[PDB]
Design a protein that fits this description.
monomer, about 120 residues, mainly alpha, DNA polymerase, domain 1, two-stranded antiparallel sheet, 7 helices, about 60% helix, oxidoreductase, jarid1C, Bright/ARID domain, helical
Amino acid sequence: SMNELEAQTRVKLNYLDQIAKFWEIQGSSLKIPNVERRILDLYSLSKIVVEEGGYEAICKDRRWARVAQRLNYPPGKNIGSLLRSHYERIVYPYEMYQSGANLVCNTRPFDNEEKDK
């Protein structure tokens, strides 16, 4: 039921087709699973993380709690780990892509993202 995400007209489909092609041709498949009957809407995720001003910052500041709750996920903030796991495997290449295109802010602790220690 991808329509759940494809709901919005010529704003969703365009972004989706793009966010599909770049990733699928990168040698992978666009796997954005579901939780709580809500698909991982990369749109809101991306604009929120960017609005926060630093993916890396949210990571080391552990603010994925309020972020998950900002996406209106159920209490317990347990969905944060899900988000991380999907980000680090799907959306993180897009950080390097987007940030690397405009200005790469996570250029140093990127190592500490791969290695959270």
